Design a protein around this ligand. Sequence first.
Ligand SMILES: [Mg+2]
Ligand SMILES: [Mg+2]
Ligand SMILES: [Mg+2]
Ligand SMILES: [Mg+2]
Ligand SMILES: [Mg+2]
Ligand SMILES: [Mg+2]
Ligand SMILES: [Mg+2]
Ligand SMILES: [Mg+2]
Ligand SMILES: [Mg+2]
Ligand SMILES: [Mg+2]
Ligand SMILES: [Mg+2]
Ligand SMILES: [Mg+2]
Ligand SMILES: [Mg+2]
Ligand SMILES: [Mg+2]
Ligand SMILES: [Mg+2]
Ligand SMILES: [Mg+2]
Ligand SMILES: [Mg+2]
Ligand SMILES: [Mg+2]
Ligand SMILES: [Mg+2]
Ligand SMILES: [Mg+2]
Ligand SMILES: [Mg+2]
Ligand SMILES: [Mg+2]
Ligand SMILES: [Mg+2]
Ligand SMILES: [Mg+2]
Ligand SMILES: [Mg+2]
Ligand SMILES: [Mg+2]
Ligand SMILES: [Mg+2]
Ligand SMILES: [Mg+2]
Ligand SMILES: [Mg+2]
Ligand SMILES: [Mg+2]
Ligand SMILES: [Mg+2]
Ligand SMILES: [Mg+2]
Ligand SMILES: [Mg+2]
Ligand SMILES: [Mg+2]
Ligand SMILES: [Mg+2]
Ligand SMILES: [Mg+2]
Ligand SMILES: [Mg+2]
Ligand SMILES: [Mg+2]
Ligand SMILES: [Mg+2]
Ligand SMILES: [Mg+2]
Ligand SMILES: [Mg+2]
Ligand SMILES: [Mg+2]
Ligand SMILES: [Mg+2]
Ligand SMILES: [Mg+2]
Ligand SMILES: [Mg+2]
Ligand SMILES: [Mg+2]
Ligand SMILES: [Mg+2]
Ligand SMILES: [Mg+2]
Ligand SMILES: [Mg+2]
Ligand SMILES: [Mg+2]
Ligand SMILES: [Mg+2]
Ligand SMILES: [Mg+2]
Ligand SMILES: [Mg+2]
Ligand SMILES: [Mg+2]
Ligand SMILES: [Mg+2]
Ligand SMILES: [Mg+2]
Ligand SMILES: [Mg+2]
Ligand SMILES: [Mg+2]
Ligand SMILES: [Mg+2]
Ligand SMILES: [Mg+2]
Ligand SMILES: [Mg+2]
Ligand SMILES: [Mg+2]
Ligand SMILES: [Mg+2]
Ligand SMILES: [Mg+2]
Ligand SMILES: [Mg+2]
Ligand SMILES: [Mg+2]
Length: 183
Amino acid sequence: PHFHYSLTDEQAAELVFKKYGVRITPEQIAKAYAPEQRMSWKKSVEVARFIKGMTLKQAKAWLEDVVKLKRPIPIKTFKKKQAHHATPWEGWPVAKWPVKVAKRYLQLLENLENNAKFKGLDVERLVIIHAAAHKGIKIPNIMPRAFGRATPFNEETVNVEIVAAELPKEVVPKRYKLNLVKR
RNA sequence: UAGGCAAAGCCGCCCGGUGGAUGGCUCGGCUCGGGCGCCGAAGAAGGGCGUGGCAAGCUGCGAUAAGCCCGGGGUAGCCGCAGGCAGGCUUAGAACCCGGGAUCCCCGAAUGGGGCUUCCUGCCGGGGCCGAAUAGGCCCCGGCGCCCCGUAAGGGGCGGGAACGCGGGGAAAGGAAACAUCUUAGUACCCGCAGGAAGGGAAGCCAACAGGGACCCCCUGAGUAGGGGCGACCGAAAGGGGGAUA
RNA sequence: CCGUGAGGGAAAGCUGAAAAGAACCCCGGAAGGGGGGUGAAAAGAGCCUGAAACCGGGCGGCUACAGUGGGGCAGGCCCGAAAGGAUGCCCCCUCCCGAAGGAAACCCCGGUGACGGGGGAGUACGAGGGAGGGGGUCCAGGGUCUGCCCUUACGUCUAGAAACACGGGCCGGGGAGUUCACGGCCGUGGCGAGCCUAAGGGGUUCAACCCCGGAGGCGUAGGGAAACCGACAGCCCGCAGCGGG
RNA sequence: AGACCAAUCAAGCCCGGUGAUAGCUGGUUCCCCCCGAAGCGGGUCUCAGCCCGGCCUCCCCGGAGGCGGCCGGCGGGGUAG
RNA sequence: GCGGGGGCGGUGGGGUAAGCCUCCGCUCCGAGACGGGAACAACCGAGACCGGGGUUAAGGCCCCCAAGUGCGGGCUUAGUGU
RNA sequence: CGUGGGGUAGGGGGGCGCGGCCGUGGGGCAGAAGCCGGGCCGUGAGGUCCGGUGGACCCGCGGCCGACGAAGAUCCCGGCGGUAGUAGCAGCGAAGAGGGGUGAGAAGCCCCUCCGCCGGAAAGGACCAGGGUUUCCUGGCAACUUCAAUAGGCCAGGAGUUAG
RNA sequence: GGACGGGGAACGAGCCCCCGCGCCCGUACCGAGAACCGACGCAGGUGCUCCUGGGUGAGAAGCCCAAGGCGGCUCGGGUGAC
RNA sequence: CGCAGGUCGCAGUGGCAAGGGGGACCUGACUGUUUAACAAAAACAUAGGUCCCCGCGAGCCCGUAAGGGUGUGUACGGGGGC
RNA sequence: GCCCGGCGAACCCACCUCCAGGUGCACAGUCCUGGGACCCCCGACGGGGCGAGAAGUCCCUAUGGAGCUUCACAGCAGCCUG
RNA sequence: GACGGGGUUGAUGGGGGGGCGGUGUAACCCCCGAGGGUUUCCCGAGGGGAGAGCCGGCCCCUCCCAAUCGCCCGAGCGUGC
Ligand SMILES: [Mg+2]
Ligand SMILES: [Mg+2]
Ligand SMILES: [Mg+2]
Ligand SMILES: [Mg+2]
Ligand SMILES: [Mg+2]
Ligand SMILES: [Mg+2]
Ligand SMILES: [Mg+2]
Ligand SMILES: [Mg+2]
Ligand SMILES: [Mg+2]
Ligand SMILES: [Mg+2]
Ligand SMILES: [Mg+2]
Ligand SMILES: [Mg+2]
Ligand SMILES: [Mg+2]
Ligand SMILES: [Mg+2]
Ligand SMILES: [Mg+2]
Ligand SMILES: [Mg+2]
Ligand SMILES: [Mg+2]
Ligand SMILES: [Mg+2]
Ligand SMILES: [Mg+2]
Ligand SMILES: [Mg+2]
Ligand SMILES: [Mg+2]
Ligand SMILES: [Mg+2]
Ligand SMILES: [Mg+2]
Ligand SMILES: [Mg+2]
Ligand SMILES: [Mg+2]
Ligand SMILES: [Mg+2]
Ligand SMILES: [Mg+2]
Ligand SMILES: [Mg+2]
Ligand SMILES: [Mg+2]
Ligand SMILES: [Mg+2]
Ligand SMILES: [Mg+2]
Ligand SMILES: [Mg+2]
Ligand SMILES: [Mg+2]
Ligand SMILES: [Mg+2]
Ligand SMILES: [Mg+2]
Ligand SMILES: [Mg+2]
Ligand SMILES: [Mg+2]
Ligand SMILES: [Mg+2]
Ligand SMILES: [Mg+2]
Ligand SMILES: [Mg+2]
Ligand SMILES: [Mg+2]
Ligand SMILES: [Mg+2]
Ligand SMILES: [Mg+2]
Ligand SMILES: [Mg+2]
Ligand SMILES: [Mg+2]
Ligand SMILES: [Mg+2]
Ligand SMILES: [Mg+2]
Ligand SMILES: [Mg+2]
Ligand SMILES: [Mg+2]
Ligand SMILES: [Mg+2]
Ligand SMILES: [Mg+2]
Ligand SMILES: [Mg+2]
Ligand SMILES: [Mg+2]
Ligand SMILES: [Mg+2]
Ligand SMILES: [Mg+2]
Ligand SMILES: [Mg+2]
Ligand SMILES: [Mg+2]
Ligand SMILES: [Mg+2]
Ligand SMILES: [Mg+2]
Ligand SMILES: [Mg+2]
Ligand SMILES: [Mg+2]
Ligand SMILES: [Mg+2]
Ligand SMILES: [Mg+2]
Ligand SMILES: [Mg+2]
Ligand SMILES: [Mg+2]
Ligand SMILES: [Mg+2]
């Protein structure tokens, strides 16, 4: 099957202009998709929200640190009964270390970087402008319980879409922006 | 003071993911009308197993196994559902359709005898094989059920079929605003027995002094007579009109 | 497929006209992704359309000193192309008419007084209905938020439901006064001291339709258990109507 | 021990009679307009039901009187005191 | 429909009494919006087609809250009371 | 004309919608039904039009007929939520570690070394019923194993049971 | 298997040597804290049904160790609050 | 299996393994059985005692019937109560 | 248990609720009058939500059952008798 | 989560040395040993002497190792009363 993106190329260009103030063409846009990943969908949503707005190299470095358990991912929405931790950012104490999600996102970012290179864009000036994760289909299963009943035990897959744009280096950020209250 | 100015969160629209509603479709169902109507010891229906070059299921077929022969129709394509890969068949007339034949494993009324495993096993006759042998042994084929009719030869019954038919055995729930007679109902259901229909059928009739004229089925007589805790409720027949006519 | 068994028993339709079923390039361990193609259209084999619930992102409004949903009025921000008006809307001014209602200063009479009365004055004004002048751009409508005013989820039994009475997590689809016989009645239609045919028969363009079929049913007369018997235009009151004054 | 007879026993299970019956409980789907109740009396194995009247609604016939009020004439009554 | 209920009156009759049982009459709720009563079916006012203007009813007029820190006389010292 | 305008149960009167039939008049590949948002009309049931999507049927009017209108039945079927990235993946007296190899990827697969558990046995030998290919070999990881996997009673292909 | 009897032939063995035949069906694997039943790769049930070396020991007890097998009663790490 | 001597510890069946004991009442003699899944008991059974129907073509019981059980039995017996 | 990595449900759910004193189908999150609260997140508990589970088995009603009893109303086998 | 201290102008954790402390006297060596035998140079439970030995989630001293390299947040401007 074919999975569409939530944002077309012209809307991506409009968002790029509205967020940075430069005008770019569809040829400066690179997309990647990872359909039906077997991982946590809530943590996938959190990771996509965090990595939106970084450059590709910044996102890759942070995801590698996440996989090495050296930098956490902030949990803003799916935070019920989740512990507090010391964080490298400011404004939010709920952090996790999603390793499986981080590896799948690293594979997706590798595909996106290859697509940008094939289109001929400079990878050092590629900024992530759109990132989304959706609940895909379910691989169902049953867990037997006491007293002869059986309850659902499902693997809810994830579809991840990412779109990045090649921007002028005078507008591309040079460091992480880690004030999540303002972010 | 307020804006730049934002957490988590809330509302509305748009796009995406999920989902499979809606709409359109239909080689399916349902109802009604008409026809046609038995199969089985010449071994049936039903079941098991098998059967395709790649084939699991369905369909078909039966070790000759999606098949064999003959005739008629049908001409150029064909090898089912089923749109793949090969290799073939066919103009010496295939496929396909119709009629007639051949084959038709095991179990099955199953019928030589068993059957706690759809498989096993006996006696007799003939045949084959191992074997030095004509011994002994093993294998193949045929016959061997019960009850009957018939002098014998020979023949009959058995099982199945969606519903309908005939004979017998035969409830309760419910209703009666309780409940027993009653009803439900001669029903449900059970046992037995037939046919393409069955059963019925040719006046020891009906009538009323006038006359009909075997039988079945339809319309009516009629919810009338009558039966009945005369309650619920049940319930004709003669006669008349038709189908048909023996 | 379930049960030892007698028995019981689902879910599940749709590519395209044609596979033209997606060549080729980059990445990926692979599912697969990007680019590039076929096709009128991806309609992509997870295959017509593709709703809502639900989840993600963007946008608009709010967002940490203020207690929530619904309604009315006023406002802030945002949309307002079409289908609505723009001959609109709003402001100001002026003019005219104007229902019920209806002042004030001031003068006069009274009361300790709050106040009453005569005049001012049925006056100024007053819902609304007409006309014109200038100024401006949208107005209606929609989303969200704020202020003020109003406001005790739904369905149900009940005298009494917001109830500490019971039912529903949400959304989609499904889901309940039917038909026959008989009887009573009503609204109409046909015929009328008569009305209708039933079964069935003939024809047909063949279950329609045309014709036949009066058997029988109900009405035309009642009383009585039954035997048995078996019926009106005479008088008065008087609505309508007609005639007379 | 009314134990057990296939997770079933003060009388198994399967299919059928069977859509058993239920005065009882739950549900019963679109809009506007006109009128608009009752929980009273009597009977009932009647008291959570039903029938006959009172109360509602609609249609028709009928034909001029009717009465939740008051004054007066002529009457009834046996309560408060 | 044949379960009624509230207020007031019959010292109704009963009962210690009861938001208690059982009769009689008007009205209201049930089946009736709305104003007042701090909320509140039946207490007071009052009966609602829709929109607007005005005036009143119950009740209120220091603030909450529209309308009076209104007027004359007298009493209360208990925040009694409102 | 009305000192007309509340109303449950219930009675009476009219209308909207859905599927089809008898007529009649039309629309449609220059885009039908359906779906999403919006404007206008109507007290209302509802109607109609605009923009997007979609891809072949549909509609106005008169008459007639119904398997004809849902918010609810601890309703039926299906899908999907919050709960929540939460409970559980402890208890029944065993458990792992180092190095190497394979591999995209290794705490967990293969080999060695160390450590441990059973040893008249939840554990070593045999084997009945029942199961029926789970046995063996090769390859693999879409699904299965309460985590992983390159492992496997799993998936695919092939093979295997010899009697006086 | 033996014995006790009847009948028959001229041959002839339970001893030695040599020759021939023995059909049909089962036969893999688990046999259970994952191959059976219990909806499950289920702490239950079926089957511990039958068998098992050394030390200590009354002991087929317990504890330790052979033969033999296992780390698959199929989550891992950190922390050392209640 | 025993005797003599020496000697250590808090502890010598040093771990493992491994009875607390006694008096009195009620009650059922005892061993045994019981409500699979809330009752293990004083409940049931029991040996012992006693009564009744029965001489067999019996008594008692089952079957529609054909017939059957007690009975391949016989009063030191079969059946039925307490 | 808590924290990290991996897998990943269920119950329950009209919407969802700070406290006091009232009112009301008489035991209010939603009504009245007050008192308070910056918002969000973690852990724990079990006072409240007349918390959840189960159309209350307790009581009554129904002209509803089932089983058992007999001196109920009837009936049928069985046995005895003519 | 937080909080507190140190972070090379440093004694923050470890190593080493010292102090203090727990247990109880290791190894080696020498003496005795009930009694037996290879007669008395052997065995032998065990006692004695010197030596303690082991250990410290405490204190001091000492830069021997590591407190590094790095990653971020952050006011700045207008408006009206
Ligand atoms: Mg179970
Ligand atoms: Mg998952
Ligand atoms: Mg926010
Ligand atoms: Mg056959
Ligand atoms: Mg046979
Ligand atoms: Mg026959
Ligand atoms: Mg019936
Ligand atoms: Mg009855
Ligand atoms: Mg009865
Ligand atoms: Mg005949
Ligand atoms: Mg005949
Ligand atoms: Mg009859
Ligand atoms: Mg589709
Ligand atoms: Mg416009
Ligand atoms: Mg216009
Ligand atoms: Mg109630
Ligand atoms: Mg009540
Ligand atoms: Mg009522
Ligand atoms: Mg209510
Ligand atoms: Mg109830
Ligand atoms: Mg509920
Ligand atoms: Mg008892
Ligand atoms: Mg029974
Ligand atoms: Mg039944
Ligand atoms: Mg009225
Ligand atoms: Mg009731
Ligand atoms: Mg009078
Ligand atoms: Mg008196
Ligand atoms: Mg009453
Ligand atoms: Mg009253
Ligand atoms: Mg009030
Ligand atoms: Mg005021
Ligand atoms: Mg009205
Ligand atoms: Mg029409
Ligand atoms: Mg309803
Ligand atoms: Mg459901
Ligand atoms: Mg969920
Ligand atoms: Mg976790
Ligand atoms: Mg846990
Ligand atoms: Mg052990
Ligand atoms: Mg051991
Ligand atoms: Mg074993
Ligand atoms: Mg294997
Ligand atoms: Mg293998
Ligand atoms: Mg397999
Ligand atoms: Mg074997
Ligand atoms: Mg297991
Ligand atoms: Mg042992
Ligand atoms: Mg070993
Ligand atoms: Mg393990
Ligand atoms: Mg753990
Ligand atoms: Mg012990
Ligand atoms: Mg005892
Ligand atoms: Mg005992
Ligand atoms: Mg028990
Ligand atoms: Mg017990
Ligand atoms: Mg006893
Ligand atoms: Mg005695
Ligand atoms: Mg006695
Ligand atoms: Mg009260
Ligand atoms: Mg509440
Ligand atoms: Mg109940
Ligand atoms: Mg109950
Ligand atoms: Mg009771
Ligand atoms: Mg009654
Ligand atoms: Mg019974």
